[PDB]
Amino acid sequence: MILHALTQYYQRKAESDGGIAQEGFENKEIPFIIVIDKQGNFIQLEDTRELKVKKKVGRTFLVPKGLGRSGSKSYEVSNLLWDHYGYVLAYAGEKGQEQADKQHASFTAKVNELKQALPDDAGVTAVAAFLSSAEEKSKVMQAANWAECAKVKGCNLSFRLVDEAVDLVCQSKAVREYVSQANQTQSDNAQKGICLVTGKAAPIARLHNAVKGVNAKPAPFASVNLSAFESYGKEQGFAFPIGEQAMFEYTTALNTLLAGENRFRIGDVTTVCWGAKRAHIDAVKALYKSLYNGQYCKPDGEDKFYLLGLSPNSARIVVRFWHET
RNA sequence: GUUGAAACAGGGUCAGCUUGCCGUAGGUGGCAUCGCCCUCGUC
Structure with missing residues (x-):
């Protein structure tokens, strides 16, 4: 009844269409979102915060779930298309480098193997060429609202291509099949x-x-x-x-x-x-x-x-x- | 004689230093206990 009713009401809410996950998703709070183009190129650093009396870490978006990073070897988990703030730019505020470079390497290897396993999907090409160009990550730090990202812990940096502005990089009709x-x-x-x-x-x-x-x-x-x-x-x-x-x-x-x-x-x-x-x-x-x-x-x-x-x-x-x- | 076992509320915290309930004040200015009665009628 403790965990059985949880699954029961989860399956009940899933068939009622009320904004819930469906096999391999989770509603996670994403503060600053890096909006780019179709083939890389950092465009803007959007932010969807400003909620109640307490400024939360943005609005909740449906992103693929992870395997947890609590532990000593927090770089061998290798998440999919979203993780911490140091998993993309390889920069940390209080943790420094060393461990931040391995996280970015694991992230780029994961996105490369995902693009190899699923080619011709537009959204994967941008996230595969952005982490390997080694030229836009420095321009991301020199943005407009970048100084408000390293002041709080647990910052999540997500990606989003153009020609949509309503569909995330992990919500297009290409990665959902692989997630399922x-x-x-x-x-x-x-x-x-x-x-x-x-x-x-x-x-x-x-x-x-x-x-x-x-x-x-x-x-x-x-x-x-x-x-x-x-x-x-x-x-x-x-x-x-x-x-x-x-x-x-x-x-x-x-x-x-x-x-x-x-x-x-x-x-x-x-x-x-x-x-x-x-x-x-x-x-x-x-x-x-x-x-x-x-x-x-x-x-x-x-x-x-x-x-x-x-x-x-x-x-x-x-x-x-x-x-x- | 083959089955929830092995599980601490915790080591320690003076709630204190300070505070006259007091300077503040006539119970009073005023009112005849009295106009009235055989302790005696007596042998």
Whole structure:
């Protein structure tokens, strides 16, 4: 019920068309976006910030999920088309060089192998020729709003070609097929079972996705980061027999329902309330809407479900709210 | 005699130094306890 209802309501919201991920995506906050042309050439440094009273790291966009970078070897992960601010320009504020060059090398190798595996796609040619030209990265630093990017941590630099201004580099009708195929091939050749919230196949998932919304840094939810929490010596993996698909689903659900209108700060904690729809409670979701307008009534439609409440800690997440009635 | 085990609230924090409830003031200017009665009628 803790993770089964998560996948249930995620699959329910997926068939209702409400801006949710679909096999290999996640709504992540992107501050400054580097808009370029069709064949490289840095054009502009757009920024979509200015939200509430606190200047967040831009607006949420659907980008392919990652495998986590928390650790000593944060350069061997090699993300797809988006990562940290130092994964493209190879420049860091407090970390310096050395480790920043290996990250850029891994990023350019990944985009080169992606262009080789999928040629003639326009969007991949720009991101493949921009990281290998070794001439526009210096002009990117000498822009207009570049001084406001190295002042905050966790900056994300994304790419976007011209002739669109509405479709990102990872949302064109070319990379979505590869993203859907990678989740049905790379994450389906590990083990055979047994799953948990589904009961079917679903191989054993390793290294859960980092959930961002309660800590200052993205941290995983259910992931044994040590060794004294495993079952019979599983070494981070077989301790929680959860499939990769269900893990991705519940992690994306928790990441999406922690920044939208369902996100509210109770008190040193960021929880989320939602119903089973078949939500629209209009009583708990509007915690800080205005001045608590008269909305509680009896519309003979009291849904069931429960109220999941996650809280930060020292490295993982703690579940405190648990009440079905 | 083959199965949740191995799990600390934490080492420590004087809530203090300062503050007269006080300088501030007539319970008073004023009112006959009295106009009235055989302690005796007596052998």
